[PDB]
Structure formats: C-alpha cells, structure tokens
Amino acid sequence: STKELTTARIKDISKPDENNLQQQAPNRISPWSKSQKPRAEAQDNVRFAVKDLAKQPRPYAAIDLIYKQPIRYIEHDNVAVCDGNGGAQGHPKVYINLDQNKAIPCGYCGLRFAQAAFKEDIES
Amino acid sequence: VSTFPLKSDINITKSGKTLLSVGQGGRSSRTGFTATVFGGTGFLGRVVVSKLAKHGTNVVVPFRNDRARRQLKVNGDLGVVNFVEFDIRNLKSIEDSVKYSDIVINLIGTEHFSKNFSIEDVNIGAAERIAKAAKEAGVSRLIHVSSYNANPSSSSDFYATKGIGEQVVRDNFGPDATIVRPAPMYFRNSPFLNELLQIKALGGNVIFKKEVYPVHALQVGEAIERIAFDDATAGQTYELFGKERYSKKELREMIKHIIHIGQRGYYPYSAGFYLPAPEPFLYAFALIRQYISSQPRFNVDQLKRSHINQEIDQSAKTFTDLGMVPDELSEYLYRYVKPHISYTSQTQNRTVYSKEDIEKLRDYVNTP
Amino acid sequence: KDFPTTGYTEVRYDAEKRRVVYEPLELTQAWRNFTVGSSVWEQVGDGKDFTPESFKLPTPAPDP
Amino acid sequence: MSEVEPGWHYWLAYGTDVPPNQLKPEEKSVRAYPVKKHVPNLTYTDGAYVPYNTARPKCATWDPKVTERP
Amino acid sequence: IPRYCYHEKLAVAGNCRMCLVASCAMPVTPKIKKAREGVTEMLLENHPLDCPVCDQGGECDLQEQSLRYGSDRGAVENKAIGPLIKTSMNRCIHCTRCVRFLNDVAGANSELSANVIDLCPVGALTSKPYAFRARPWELKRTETIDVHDALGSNVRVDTRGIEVMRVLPRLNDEINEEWISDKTRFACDGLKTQRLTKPLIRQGNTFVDATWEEALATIAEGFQKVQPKENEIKAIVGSLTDLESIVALKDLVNKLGSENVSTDGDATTVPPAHGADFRSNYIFNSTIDNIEEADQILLVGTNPRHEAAVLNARIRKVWLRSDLEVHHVGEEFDSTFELNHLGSDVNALAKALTGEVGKKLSEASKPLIIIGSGVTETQDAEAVYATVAKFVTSNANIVTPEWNGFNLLHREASRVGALDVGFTTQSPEVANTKAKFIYLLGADEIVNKDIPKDAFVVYQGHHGDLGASFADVILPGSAYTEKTATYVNTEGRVQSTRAATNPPGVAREDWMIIRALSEYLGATLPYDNLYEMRSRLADVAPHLLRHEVVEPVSEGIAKVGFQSLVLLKNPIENFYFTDVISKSSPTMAKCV
Amino acid sequence: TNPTAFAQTTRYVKDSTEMRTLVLNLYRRYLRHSRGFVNNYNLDIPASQVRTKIRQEFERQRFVKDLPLKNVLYMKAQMEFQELVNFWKQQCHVMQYFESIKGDSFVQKFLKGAQ
Amino acid sequence: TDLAKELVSGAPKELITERVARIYQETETWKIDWDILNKGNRWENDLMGYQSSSDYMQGTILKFDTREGAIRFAKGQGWDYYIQEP
C-alpha cells in the first residue's frame, strides 16, 4: 500500500507482522514522528544493495509499548507523584494535576495518571 | 579533474530521475549520481573510479579480487565507494551492481583466454549480459569501452570480439549506448609501456614493429567522465587517440637512452635487451606457455596483432568533439619511465628530459 | 585570533598522482557554534581589593 | 569474544561475583519487548550495520498542479 | 539589578520583590545579597523540576537569576488559549507580565497575542510550533526585517543550519518597538512547504523538472514565438518582491522596447491616485516615531488591525497616556482603541472636513491623516486623494518646516520600493494593451489581472501557488530569509535583509535570474554582481544606498506634490492569508 | 649550540638600499641552487623552468613600498630557502608547488551555482 | 596604519577579494563575522544527515572592546567590511 509505511499516524490501522522488514519498527508499521524518515525509504539505498535487512538493528517502538501500560489511578487525591519508579535512577520527580477528566501522562516516563473517580469516563 | 565536473547543479537523467548536486566539488560534496564501474579494479578502473569518487559520485565497484579493491575505497568519502562481490557467470550479482546506478561503465575485457574464460566469453558474453542487465534496471546511460581497432570481420580474435561486442551492446541496451575506442594507454604501470620497459623482451624484432597512436590514460579517464555527465554523448562512438603516431620500435629505443642502458656498449646486448627470434619459434613459445604457464604471457593472438597497425575510424568522434586537447607522449614519456632509470638518485645531476628533448631524442633514434 | 581553527587546506592521497596532496577544506560535519549561549548577564562581580596598606595612597585629614 | 552474551560478559571480567543465572528478582532487568537469541558482531558479513539518516528532508518541494488560464 | 516583574514598556508592579535595594516602583551589601537569596528560594519553592523538558532552558530568567543571586542548595492545571501558545502554568512565577500586555497594549484572540511568549520570563508560556525542537545555544541569530507587512518590523531570525527555527522581534524604537504580529512569527514554517526548488517546464497539463539552461532557453523560444511588440511585454511584481529584482526586471523590459510594467494590485486608475512622481505623495512623511506626539489622526479607508498590526498598537498606547482623538472614515471594524466613526464613503469624509473634525485638525499642533492601501483600489480614490490633498494644501499646520502631516500607509512591502524606482506605468495607452509575454516576478494576486490564452507566462518565485499554476515555465526563486535584499517600508526608510540561509534546491537569487535571462534574450544587462547591482540602484534613486535612513522630503517640493492631487472597504478579507509564505504555513491553517 | 646549515641571523634592516642588495643576493642563491632542487626533489621539469618560477615569485613583490613589509617578506624568503636546500620539505610538497595553474562568464557560473 | 599586513599574514586571497566581513555590536563588545557563502554555506550529508560546509570562516567570531579597534583591525588586514550601525 506504501501509505502505512511512509506516513506518520497516531495508531496503526492494521496488524504489525514482526517478520515484515519494511515496517518502521517490529511492533509498529508507520513512523511515529513527522520528521522521522520512513524505514522503507531509508533502506532503498545503494548501501543496502547486498546487505541482509533482517540483521539490521530494529528496536521496538516505544510509542506502542508505553501505551500498553495500564492507566494509574490515585485514590483520595488530586495530584499524582512520579519519579521514574527508580528513585535516584529514575527521572526528576514531578507532580501531575488531575483536575481534568482525562489521563495526563508523565512528562518523562509517559505513564498516564488519572483519578479513580474518573475511571468510567476515561475507559469509554 | 577540475573543481566541479558538472555544468549545472541539476541533471535530469534520461530515465526520468532528477539529481541535484551539493557542495563545491571536494571530497565532502556530492553530484547526486550513482555509477557502476565494471572492471574498476583494473588499470583503467582505478583511474575512472578515482575521478568519480573524488567529486562525490557514488561508485559501485563489482570485484572478483578482494585485495585489489581495497585501494579504491580511499578515493571517496564515507559511503561513496561500494563493493559487490560478483562474477560474469553469476546473474544475481550482476543485477545487484546496477540496481541503483544511473550510469554503468563497462571496462571488462581481456586480450587473453584461460581455463575458465575465452575471449568470446568476456569481450562479448559479459558485455552483452551487462548491457541487458543494465536495461532491465532502468539505467539511463551505458558506456562500453572497446579497443582502437574494433572490427567484426578482423583476423585477430581480440579485434574481432571487440568489434562484435560493440554491436551486441547496442543491440541489447539500445541505440543510446555510448562506445569508447581508446588507443594504447600510457601511464604509471601501463600495460602498453610495461612491455616496452621490460628488458628481456623475446622476439621484439617482430612484436615491436606495430605502429600506434598512444593516448594518456588520465585523458581517457577524463573523457569517460565527460561522457557520463553529458547526455549529448549518448549513442556516440569515440576514438580516443594521440595526435602523433609511434612504432613500438621507436619507443623501445627512445626508452633505452632514458634508462641509460646504453651507457655501456656491451651491457644491453649482454643483458638480453635484444632477443631476436624466428616467428615460428615465437608462435610455438606463445602456444606452449598458453597451456603450461599459469600467468598470462605473450599469447598467440598478440603475435598476430603485432603486424596489424592502428587504424583510426574516420566516422567516429575524437577528443575535439568532447572539447579537449589530447596530451602529447613527448610531454609525459619521461615522468612515466622515470621510475625505471637505473642510477638517478641525485648521483651527480639528473637528466630531466623536457618535451623538446624527447622529440630531439626521437630523431636520434631514427638516425641509422 | 583571525586564523580559523580548522585552517584552510586539508591533505589526502591522490591515486592518479600517487602522492598526498593539499586541497581546500571541506568538512562532512561543520563545526557547531554552541558558544552563542554566552550569558546575557555578568557572573563575577567587581571583586575584593587586597592591595597592601603600605601601597595605598594616604588620605588627607579632616579640617582642624 | 563477541559471542559471549552481555550477561556473562561482565561476570567473566570479574565485574560481579553474582552470575546472571543467580540474580535476585529485583536486580533482574525487566523488559517490555521479546528477547531473541544473542547475536555476535556481524562485521565482515552481510549482516553488518549500515548507517543512515533517520530524518526526512528539511524542505518539501511544491507538487505541481496546472489550472486552465481564464 | 535582578528583576522578574520590571519592564519599562509595561505598568509598574511590585509582585516579584527581586529589585530590592521595590526600586522599580520606588522613584528617585550583605543584607541585600541575603535578601536576593531569600526571595529566590521562594520562587523555587514550588517550581516544577522541568528544565530538561522545558523550552526556556537555556534562555530562562529564573535559572540565570537563581545562579547569579541565589544559593546553590535548596500543581496547577494547564489551560488552552489557542493553538499558538503552549501553556504550562506550573512554571509560572506569578509576575503579571501577561496581564499587562493582554489588556493595555493588545486590547483583547488577537493579532499581537503571541508577543506574550516573549514577556513571560519562564516556561509558563512558550511557542507551540517551536516546542521541543531546538535549544537557544544551537541557534544562529540573524538580524533582518519583516516582509509580511509594509511596516518592515525588525525581526531576529534564529536558524539551525539550513532550517529556520523561530522568528523573534528585535529592538527598533522607530518602527515596531519590540513587538511583532502573530503572522510575523508563525508563518516561517511556510518556507519549508510548497517550495520552488527546481525549474519546471509545462508540457500539456503537467509540469516536469528542468535545468536552468533549458528553462532560460524555453523562454527564448517562447519570447521569439509570440513575438510581443513594443508595449505587449507585461511584467508584474508581487508583494514579497525585493528591490534589486524590481530594477533588474524594469531594465530588462525596457531593453526589449517596453514600458508595460506594473504590480499585482487592482487599482482601476492606471496612474495611482497618490502618484509616484513625488515621494512625499505616498510615504509616511510624519514617520512612525512621531505618531507618539499626535493630536488628531484621520484614518481614511484603512484598517490598522489588519493592514499593519504593530503600528496599530502605537495608536492605542498614545490613546491611554494622553487625550488623543482619532476619527476614522470607512467600513466599521472591531478596534483595540476608541474610534469616532464618521461614515463609510467619501461624502462623509468631505463632510467631516467641513465639520468639527476639520476645526480640530486646523488648530492641532501635530495633525495626522492616514490613507489606506486599499483606497487606491476603490473607485473614489480620486475623490479622497483630492479632498484630503486640498485640505492639506489649504491649511498651514499640515505642511510646516518642522512637521509634515500627510502619510500614506501601505500593506505590502514591495509597493514603496517599486514606486521609488518608478516601477509603475503612468499611462492607460500602455496599460490597456494586450500582453503576449508575461513575467510574474513573484506575483500571485492575478485573480483580477487579464492573462491572454496565448500569452507566454513565466512565474518566478519562492512558493508554489495559483500564480505558479498559470505559468508556462517556472523559475525557482529565493525567499527573503535567503537573499541579501533591499526593502523600503511605507515611511521611505531603506532597510536591507541579511541572508541567513541558502535557497533550497537549485534556486537562485531573484535578480540573478533576470540578469541571466537577459543574456538569453539579447537584452544583456550590465550587471555582474550585487555591488554593481546596488550602484545601479543609486542611478534610479540616490537615497536607496542609505540603509536605515529616512530621507525627508523638502517642504517646498512636497507642497506641489500635495497640490497636483487636486464604500471604503477594508482590503484584507483574511488576516492569516496575505502572502504566499503565510498560505503554505500549516500553523496558519490551525489558526483558521 | 650551533645553527643549522644555511641559517641566517634575523636582523631588522632600516635602509632601503641595504635591503635591496640583500634581496638581490638571495635571488641569486635561489637561481644557483635551482639545479640542486631538481636533483634532490626529483622534479619532472628542467632547472630552467625552476628558475622561471623563482623569478615570478620575486616579481610578485617587486613593487612593495613599506620597509617593515620588506623585512618580513625577506625573512620569510630566507626561511623558505633554508627549507628547500636542506631537503626538509618532503618531495610531495615541492611537486605540488609546480602544480599551481580562463574564468567563466556570468551565465556559465549561474548555471553551475556560481561561487 | 596603511601597511598591507595581508601580504605577510599568510591568509588566502579570498578574504580580501571575495569574502565580506561585518562589524557589529550585538551588547557591550564589537564583533566581526563573515557573510555566508551564497552556495556552499551548508549542504546536507547524504550518509548521516550531517551539515557539511566549505566555509572555513563560518565559526570565526572576532571580539573587540571598542568600535575603533574593530575598524582599525579590518583595514589593517585589507578586509572588505561593512559596519552594522546599532
């Protein structure tokens, strides 16, 4: 189709086949940033003429992995505290306001926090 | 050479691609072109690949010898020179070389034959296969380098196969294929001058009587660069030769004085500088070494060609059609035989033969 | 101060000439000038004087 | 030497006295992606790493469209 | 002396307490050092740890004054105020600089509302298109001018290599005064889309790539085919066209025996109602700085909200610090300052000159009259430009040795520069002639100008738009950020853009294109470099080689120019779409 | 210590007449050692061409008026001479020195992007 | 003052014949930088996207304490310069 391989989208429209070497990542088909060069166009070069594409470095896309984590829910509070879940080996500690009726991701980790009283609306 | 080998920063290939150029022409610059030089590890390929890679043209060099290709990488910046292990009996490897190139240069050609390849396999079978593979890959320009006396109806198996190879290249790639017919090329480690610089040349009384119009190898490499980057040269045949005609007997005798082998009245005759032999012995010895020696020696067909002189095809185009003046062997003969001068080494005073001195020496050689 | 830190020429080995030759400079990655982050303020103050009292000029006394 | 897995590369160099087959549950790395068989250095093979620019061209050329002249 | 809440362009505040000796509000040592440390810790008590992910990182006033005047040891939800300002109020230090600008200068959703990003000293308010893309130490700073409006506001262009990152205002107390409009800063992303990078040759209903040698040869085979006679060679100059290219195109058509040169405007009267004969007839003779000392200003067929947003803020500033009264004639509009509306035609303007407005303007020490750029495109331009001129000439205060009270306010930068080099034909005999060879020097306002079906049309520009569609041969040009050009604003000041980046693709400098085309058409111009090009500029107008200098017109000569002159719809239908660079902007589409 | 071979002590000449003689003496030394340059550096040109090249460099600075510039030019010309005679320069540098050398029109430069 | 110090500096001729310098006060010192090349100032590297250049003066920024020093030095080197008035 060449459209899911060369365009940046929020979510993939089809199932990622990890044996397809034209995908941007083994778990994601389309690029996850507007300036990111599509992997299909990158490998269409003179330097890839006689190389094995399967052995080239293909890390999994972080955008697909971070959103499979469940939304954290806070009980009896309006502020979520995150410090990378590692302390001195995590990220700087930040406080996340939960006033709105939505899941607000962490500025470093990407973990999406929410209030438990807003659980049903967000799951919808 | 120059500083930028292009007339513009935009070039639309005849295949439809538009190629832009970046930079002022140094090692870090690019021309936007991808070229494939078959036979790049050979004598002329090293000249051609160096001229393409220095200006940023990506060069694909298919090789069969892993050691010979290493020096080619130094010519270009990172990523500019690329190598593909290949064989003319392998079709997948040949397609991989031309898969991305916009220009294909064919320098593959031998004057000998061996246990694995005949002169028909290389000068015809390889050229035909490469031209067809280039066409199926959408290559905009093909350049095929034949010899100076190419003729489909020649008595020499080398001249004949070179002449037929010219025909098959056009019959496969189409009328737009360009053909180059270089004369004997002189340079450092030149096959033309190497046999003249050899001391124990057997049967020179027959071999060295052929007359030719030798041409500088740097200009032949420069001319091919002009042809590939100018689409007005498609479908044309170029005869690249020097202005002056020399016989190998003259150059052999002119070289002798520059090497100063004649400083002794006895040494050249004692050392084997002259090795006269009847032509039947030259035939038998060439025939015998064709099935005993493992290295390509003076073979039977080169013995036949010793009689045939170089004939300039008048219907073809010259250096002047490319806007270039041919170099003169008189102005380059000394510096290329300079490595072979015996004592030199600032002993008392070097005898640097200027262009004027070389022509004066030529008359003295021809004086009986 | 006016001589550029990368100079003007660079060397490489020329296969046709069989020798190393100088050529005008070209860089695959140009030098990046992060120095433009020079502070819009001054960091160090005016400092503290430590001149020996034996070398300071005397001050005239007040009026009788 | 590149055939040695990174877990035991540190142990062989006396980096730690705990082999990676005796790690505590807390001290063991947690990965959110599948872990395949260890791949050694791929230089001199067709699997050697080929670098490339991961960013798009910084400017997009105008896609030409023709309109009839009134 | 550190501060967070002090800025002389705004009102005085004492809610930051960093200027203690509040010296900002107060008119005219270890305790002070301790005091600065104590105040600094209070701001950092609640501040989030966001510096790595915060756009103010290398250019943060809170960081620098924590380092300089503090010790080294020590949750508010976000809002949405538009797709242009990214708000992270956790970082706000509660300094009220946003409130003072949004209510006193802006008058607000505004054409100046994006300037609050500059005033916010911390990362509470940051540019949204610029978010996460660059650090201030990566950027090369280039001082140039704006061409999105006729003001010529002095902007600072920060480039990271080839790319242009952001546009920031730079100080100039004579034109813009530290402010730029939202168009001036958020249209830079149009320079990366729809760009003309390759010569395109039209073959049927398609365009294909071409070389410069061919694209300048097809024109020659196109110029020798249609064979335009004397006044059949029509050359058109657009809004964003530099002066060095206007003069080159003017001389090229002259060497082909033609004078049919014009702009992309739709002025019905071929000689513009102001006339290009005298400079004083079409420039801001009072100069932008002297708008401060205004007593009575008459706005005639102009909408400063859209025609020139930065200068509009100057009017509001005087309206607050004094008792300025501004009387406006024409179509009504929402205004940031009080306006006494009079009428929507020229009958009211004449009647206003016979009413209380004229009496105040007669006895005003420094009167002002401002005529819109769209007035010349309206039918009653002759009526206005004679009604006002007769009023100007009949009275004394309007034209005095110390004060000149007539000013024309344009909207497109190339206008005044074209007028000074006499790039406007002064005859309807030349203008009405049919055209056979058309050269669109960056002109895209051709929805109203005739284009014959058989006329050879060449578009030279830096963007692909409607004007490029009509072309037969397209020549790529360089945008203002890429060329060392010359622009003259509405007040007659010569300002030169400084090249920050190279043009893209194989695009060339705009005037070098015309000079090269001349050699192909036998009209070889004598120009060989920019210095020789700029020497020619002095041969068309002597003042053009005087950068950043206004050459005031002599009083006596300007009087004759005023004398010889003897529905006002707003010209701009959409603010976000004025020039080609704004149209390609994706950010401006979000504003729409 | 002792200076290297063909070394001259640096002196600031204050007389234009005395400076002119020192320049002419050095110019003769360049011509005399021209055959030595061809021998040591294995040049591909006659010594006659080398002497021609020497004269061109001396002709470039023929009309330098300021005395302070003359001393610096003279001092640098002496250093180069000491470099060539003592064979301190590598042969590649001397070969490239003789490798040194019609400008294109406006359109020709315009087509290729100019300079 | 009027000495052609460019004759003994060792710099290439293009600084005198081709390149143009700018003298400016950016806010307490006077600087000298060079106008960019029309072509060759930057071009994207095709391999890794690096910013290539053939301008060897691109990163050079002289600093001066007075306006007089900047002008005097530029004249002493025979530089083609324009002063950006503050």
Ligand SMILES: NC(=O)C1=CN([C@@H]2O[C@H](COP(=O)(O)OP(=O)(O)OC[C@H]3O[C@@H](n4cnc5c(N)ncnc54)[C@H](OP(=O)(O)O)[C@@H]3O)[C@@H](O)[C@H]2O)C=CC1
């Ligand atoms: N004086 C001259 O040199 C003349 C040259 N020519 C022609 O110009 C062309 C360039 O030859 P030149 O560089 O001078 O000297 P070479 O003998 O080295 O040219 C032969 C080139 O083609 C390759 N070649 C030959 N046979 C094969 C084969 N079966 N398979 C793969 N490659 C093969 C060689 O590869 P490899 O290097 O690995 O062995 C080599 O690169 C030749 O075709 C020659 O016929 C004609 C007239 C004058």
Ligand code: SF4
């Ligand atoms: S506003 Fe300044 S102090 Fe606060 S997070 Fe941003 S850079 Fe750091």
Ligand code: SF4
């Ligand atoms: S948002 Fe910014 S400008 Fe407004 S009060 Fe807070 S720090 Fe000041």
Ligand code: FES
């Ligand atoms: S600057 Fe005076 S209290 Fe803020």
Ligand SMILES: [K+]
């Ligand atoms: K800010």
Ligand SMILES: [Zn+2]
């Ligand atoms: Zn977190």
